[PDB]
Amino acid sequence: EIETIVRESEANRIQAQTWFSHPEKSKVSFRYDERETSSIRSISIETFLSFYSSKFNREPYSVLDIGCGQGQVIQYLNSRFQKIELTGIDSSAQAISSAKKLGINASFICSNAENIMQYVSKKQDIIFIHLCFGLFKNPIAIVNTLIHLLSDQSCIYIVDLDRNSLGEGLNTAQSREEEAYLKDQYRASLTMEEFKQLLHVVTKEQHGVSFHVGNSFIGGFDETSSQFFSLMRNRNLQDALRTSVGEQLKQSQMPALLHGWIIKNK
Numbered sequence: 001e002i003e004t005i006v007r008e009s010e011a012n013r014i015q016a017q018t019w020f021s022h023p024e025k026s027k028v029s030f031r032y033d034e035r036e037t038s039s040i041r042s043i044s045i046e047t048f049l050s051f052y053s054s055k056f057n058r059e060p061y062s063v064l065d066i067g068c069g070q071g072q073v074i075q076y077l078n079s080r081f082q083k084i085e086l087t088g089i090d091s092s093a094q095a096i097s098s099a100k101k102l103g104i105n106a107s108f109i110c111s112n113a114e115n116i117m118q119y120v121s122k123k124q125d126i127i128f129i130h131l132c133f134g135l136f137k138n139p140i141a142i143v144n145t146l147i148h149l150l151s152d153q154s155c156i157y158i159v160d161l162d163r164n165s166l167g168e169g170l171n172t173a174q175s176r177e178e179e180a181y182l183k184d185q186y187r188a189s190l191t192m193e194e195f196k197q198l199l200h201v202v203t204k205e206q207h208g209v210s211f212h213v214g215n216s217f218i219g220g221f222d223e224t225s226s227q228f229f230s231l232m233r234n235r236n237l238q239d240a241l242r243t244s245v246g247e248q249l250k251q252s253q254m255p256a257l258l259h260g261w262i263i264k265n266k
């Protein structure tokens, strides 16, 4: 039962979340995240944009960003599109105040993502959950709720740490505080096996809604898959991958992440 696995790892997830809700700890997590995770942001975004265009033959009308932090993902989208409805939600008041100060045409909500349907009624073409799934107290509840908000042509794209990657994941820590941070983050994470079970359970009773999970770099799609072939044809995704020397090497050295899709096609 995936429910019990999720309930029994709840304390770990609460602990991981202290790194985003405590004043001193938040300084450590921000510094690490900006240094080590910023370059993957554009890759993950262009992956879902390439997927959407390939699958549905139009650009999305709306992106909902779950755990949006200081609004960096929404800023990126704002620079790529003008006529996209952008929404971000984060339970950190400090993060949301920072996002609002950007002065972007976007809606920012300060609340547990569990409460999203109080703030968004129009169905969403893309729901993005980037590098934060393992922080949620009630991840299955959040996903079930998000599925209600999916448009007839839509996807949830989830990218997160794999618990089995802890050992390799510690390599990028540069201080004892960062080491402690990463240990807590990986301990709260799911494994590939657990993540697959979760996405199966939340989609199996939902008509026209499917899932895919993988640990391959580009959306978890194997390099021999038809999906990978289609994604890699997209010049915007190519451009995002064509980054600095140091960031390409960082991306090469990174442990494999979990990549999950919940896809609705009515």
Ligand SMILES: Nc1ncnc2c1ncn2[C@@H]1O[C@H](CSCC[C@H](N)C(=O)O)[C@@H](O)[C@H]1O
Binding pocket: 017, 020, 033, 037, 041, 066, 067, 068, 069, 070, 073, 089, 090, 091, 092, 095, 111, 112, 113, 114, 129, 130, 131, 132, 135, 136, 137
């Ligand atoms: N239950 C919840 N609802 C909304 N946001 C949450 C949450 N639990 C944690 N978060 C937020 O998740 C973020 C994790 S770090 C930022 C992740 C961001 N999506 C990125 O791509 O880098 C933090 O800002 C934290 O406040």
Ligand SMILES: C=CCOC(=O)c1csc([C@@H](N)CCCNC(=N)N)n1
Binding pocket: 016, 033, 036, 037, 131, 132, 133, 134, 135, 160, 161, 169, 172, 182, 184, 185, 186, 188, 189, 190, 254, 255
């Ligand atoms: C190369 C290493 C890749 O490292 C990361 O992507 C990373 C490390 S810590 C972090 C934060 N965004 C919080 C992660 C929240 N998720 C889980 N704990 N599962 N992201």
